[PDB]
Design a protein around this ligand. Structure first.
Ligand SMILES: Cc1cc2nc3c(=O)[nH]c(=O)nc-3n(C[C@H](O)[C@H](O)[C@H](O)COP(=O)(O)OP(=O)(O)OC[C@H]3O[C@@H](n4cnc5c(N)ncnc54)[C@H](O)[C@@H]3O)c2cc1C
Ligand SMILES: COc1ccc(C(=O)O)cc1
Length: 565
């Protein structure tokens, strides 16, 4: 039987599986609940990514509980269910976080092996810069020296231009005090306006399955099983005086018989920030009171399981624009779509290689803001962001379909440094029931205050000379007036959503410590033979879309595992 069992063939899981099997005497079994990622056009052509989830066979079909912060709205909580995990359904944006993110991870765990300097080696293992699809000149769009040249995942600058690009660039000159240009987020200094970098190579998605699993497919010491949902982690004895969890039960679907397998060395949980805590709770690792309320016997009492959930909340906003070059008609007119698809199929170029956004702004509140009377600074540090602003050459709104008429650009914000914390809990002891996902969005004055400020910032940005002949008006009339705080707050509470970056539900913390679920080496506290390598270990929201930091967790996790062999 196998040396390791990896639960979840996801963003991080695939790194662990591929890295461990580099050694021919180490065998790994990967168990993935979902289907194959092969022959999924929507998971290959970059521009088609937003259609893939939430309501589909490639999604877990999770939702949140009703959010009082959102006027009682419950929202979709998409999560990839397939080879590659969420890296097969994500929007491919790549950055690693701020130096302050990783230094805070090191400080909070007492482990300097996290920390900005010591993590850089894994950027180089993880990524290689390849040409953008349109083969444009990337000089001055990034800094080659801070990025990998040889690593597994293909990354590139935007493969298709938009009419937004020159106008965003002009705004960095015209409004340089607020919206200065940033040469590369890979410096660990996120603030300012940078060109998007994305996990796209030869005009198609570079996911954790394409980058790690596929090249490793002919290895006899690696097995990958799809349609295999792990339903229980099995207490398989007592090694080192602690309960051991080296066996798992899995099934194809609800009501199907369960297969048992055991790892000789360790079970690695890579089920992600939703999947990991819920499986733990189903296995009797969690909050005693919550477990017994649903009929589960607690084997390891740890109330941190599924707590300390952070996410980046999302705010969408569309604006009518005077342009015939937005991407909107690709999704309305079959002739245009089919011309673009033929070009993508034959040459791997054209509009289908385009990203959700070619530029991103990372921004702080003024250091003298009224909110700092009542709150300490929740940012990772003085060089980190409070919010993000994303510029898209089309309609983008997770909860409202694209209008039949109109050309649009969208300005999407993410709250990067929330004060709010949430939790993930079991509604029942049945592994095929949906969990209760309660992020507690907009439940603090800080979080709503910052979002009101973000909107005012967006409107300053778009009032610039570069936009004069382009932006017509906001889709929603509550965005007509920058001084109307009541209208702005109403807009936010009715439109806010999620940008799909949950972390923290199995937080790392120092060995033997207060709260947390895992040690700094990612071993589960109070258990032997169980390791967590995914987004759930990160104790704070980073200054980054989460694929980049999660890949670093995956690469270091693999080295941590090899060190105990
Ligand atoms: C719509 C969307 C867009 C996004 N866009 C971006 C972006 O542009 N840039 C960015 O950086 N990030 C983005 N993200 C976030 C990023 O995709 C995730 O944060 C990251 O990929 C998660 O990595 P992970 O390894 O923690 O989990 P995942 O990649 O989600 O992996 C978990 C895997 O485990 C499987 N699994 C779960 N439970 C079980 C079980 N019991 N048994 C067996 N298998 C199981 C799942 O099916 C999945 O394959 C996006 C996310 C979404 C939902
Ligand atoms: C509006 O564009 C984006 C870009 C990235 C993401 C993400 O990281 O999920 C969401 C929306």
């Amino acid at each position: 039987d196998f040396d390791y069992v990896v639960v979840g063939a996801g963003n991080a899981g695939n790194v662990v599986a591929a890295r461990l099997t580099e050694d021919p005497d180490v065998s790994v079994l990967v168990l993935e609940a979902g289907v194959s990622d092969e022959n999924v056009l929507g998971a290959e052509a970059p521009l088609l990514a937003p259609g893939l989830v939430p309501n589909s066979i490639f999604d877990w079909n999770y939702t949140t509980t009703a959010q009082a912060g959102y006027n009682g709205r419950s929202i979709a909580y998409p999560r990839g269910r397939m080879l590659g995990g969420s890296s097969s359904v994500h929007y491919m944006v790549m950055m690693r976080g701020s130096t302050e993110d990783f230094d805070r991870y090191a400080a909070v765990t007492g482990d300097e092996g996290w920390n900005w300097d010591n993590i850089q080696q894994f950027v180089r293992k993880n990524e290689m810069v390849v040409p953008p699809a349109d083969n444009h000149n990337t000089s001055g769009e990034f800094i080659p020296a801070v990025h990998g040249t040889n690593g597994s995942v293909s990354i590139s600058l935007p493969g298709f231009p938009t009419p937004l690009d020159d106008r965003v660039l002009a705004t960095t000159q015209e409004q340089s005090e607020e919206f200065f240009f940033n040469p590369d987020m890979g410096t660990g200094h996120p603030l300012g306006i940078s060109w998007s970098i994305a996990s796209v190579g030869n005009g198609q998605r570079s996911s954790s399955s394409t980058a790690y699993l596929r090249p490793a497919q002919s290895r006899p010491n690696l097995s990958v099983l799809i349609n295999a949902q792990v339903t229980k982690l099995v207490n398989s004895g007592t090694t080192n005086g602690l309960p051991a969890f080296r066996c798992v039960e899995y099934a194809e679907q609800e009501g199907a018989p369960t297969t048992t397998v055991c790892a000789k060395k360790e079970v690695v949980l890579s089920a992600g920030s939703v999947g990991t805590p819920i499986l733990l709770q189903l296995s009797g690792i969690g909050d005693e009171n919550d477990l017994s309320s649903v009929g589960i016997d607690t084997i390891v009492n740890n109330p941190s399981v599924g707590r300390n959930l952070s996410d980046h909340l999302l705010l969408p906003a569309a604006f009518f624009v005077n342009s015939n070059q937005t991407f909107d008609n690709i999704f309305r007119d079959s002739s245009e779509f089919n011309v673009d698809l033929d070009q993508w199929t034959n040459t791997r170029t054209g509009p289908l290689t385009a990203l959700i956004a070619n530029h991103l702004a990372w921004l702080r509140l003024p250091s003298n803001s009224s909110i700092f009377q009542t709150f300490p600074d929740p940012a990772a540090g003085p060089n980190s962001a409070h919010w993000e602003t994303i510029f898209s050459n089309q309609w983008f709104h997770p909860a409202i379909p694209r209008p039949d008429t109109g050309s649009f650009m969208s300005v999407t914000n993410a709250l990067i440094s929330p004060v709010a914390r949430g939790d993930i809990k079991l509604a029942t002891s049945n592994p095929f029931d949906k969990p209760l996902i309660n992020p507690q969005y907009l439940s603090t004055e800080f979080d709503i205050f910052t979002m009101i400020q973000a909107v005012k910032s967006n409107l300053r940005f778009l009032s610039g000379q570069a936009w004069a002949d382009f932006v017509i008006r906001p889709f929603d009339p509550r965005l007509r007036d920058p001084t109307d705080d009541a209208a702005i707050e109403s807009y936010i509470r009715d439109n806010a959503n999620t940008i799909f970056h949950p972390v923290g539900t199995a937080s790392m913390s120092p060995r033997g410590a207060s709260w947390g679920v895992v040690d700094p080496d990612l071993k589960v506290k109070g258990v032997d033979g169980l390791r967590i390598v995914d987004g759930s270990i990160l104790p704070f929201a980073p200054n980054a879309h989460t694929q980049g930091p999660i890949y670093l967790v995956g690469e270091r996790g693999a080295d941590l595992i090899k060190a105990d062999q």
